[PDB]
């Protein structure tokens, strides 16, 4: 595409530079170019792809929430709605771009549990971001697409990864947020966070000091949500 004339290794190097410079739009464009070279991604490369798009869409979501709040207060000229719609359309375009990379062809080529779970978690997340802005029409279908991606990732992670694996933990955290914030299922969110936390606690004894630090950091996020929800 736009990055078709740049070497894969140069795109990866530039994505790392863009991260250091906090240029996340550039980072995402470099990683899109790398994915479109057609080769599978290593663990580090998958993280670069996810970090780039999470930061781009995170800024869009924060702006959408500011504008949606102003619009709701205005509804209690067309400019606030028009501008919220502009940001919303841009956000949807970024989510569709990520989902398109996962569908062409990252997921189908991902055979190891670590890569397949990582990509299915991403698919759940980007459908979840689409669901946050969706209103009634395909809102149900978007929610089901998120749920289905998260569920397949959960099924694989429970069979193939230990309960302390950081991707398994982050998948459970984000699926619990999906249940609480999107699916109107706070009891399912609380149950998932509690079971995930407890099963990780029981497996910490198997870990090195560095892996212990990685796993306990995500467990604290599960605990923080449980404290907010209970």
């Amino acid at each position: 595409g736009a990055m078709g004339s740049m070497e894969r290794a140069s795109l990866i190097q530039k994505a790392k530079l863009a991260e250091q410079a906090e240029r996340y739009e550039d980072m995402a464009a470099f990683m899109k170019g790398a994915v479109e070279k057609g080769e599978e991604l290593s663990c580090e490369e998958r993280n670069l792809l996810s970090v780039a798009y999470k930061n781009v869409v995170g800024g869009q979501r924060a702006a959408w929430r500011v504008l949606s709040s102003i619009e709701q207060k205005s509804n209690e000229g067309p400019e606030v709605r028009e501008y919220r719609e502009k940001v919303e359309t841009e956000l949807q375009g970024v989510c569709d771009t990520v989902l398109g990379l996962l569908d062409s062809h990252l997921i189908k080529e991902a055979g190891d549990a670590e890569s397949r779970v990582f990509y299915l978690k991403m698919k759940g997340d980007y459908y979840r971001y689409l669901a946050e802005v969706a209103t009634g029409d395909d809102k149900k279908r978007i929610i089901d697409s998120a749920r289905s991606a998260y569920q397949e990732a959960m099924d694989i992670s429970k069979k193939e990864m230990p309960p302390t694996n950081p991707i398994r933990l982050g998948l459970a955290l984000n699926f619990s947020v999906f249940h609480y914030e999107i699916a109107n299922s706070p009891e399912e969110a609380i149950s998932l966070a509690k079971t995930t936390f407890d099963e990780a606690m029981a497996d910490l004894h198997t870990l090195s000091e560095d892996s212990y630090k990685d796993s306990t950091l995500i467990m604290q996020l599960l605990r923080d949500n449980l404290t907010l929800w209970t």
Binding site: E19, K54, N174, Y180, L221, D224, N225, L228, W229
Partner: peptide, 8 residues
């Protein structure tokens, strides 16, 4: 509710 954060 907090999801996995973006990197540092």
């Amino acid at each position: 509710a907090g999801s996995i954060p973006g990197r540092r």
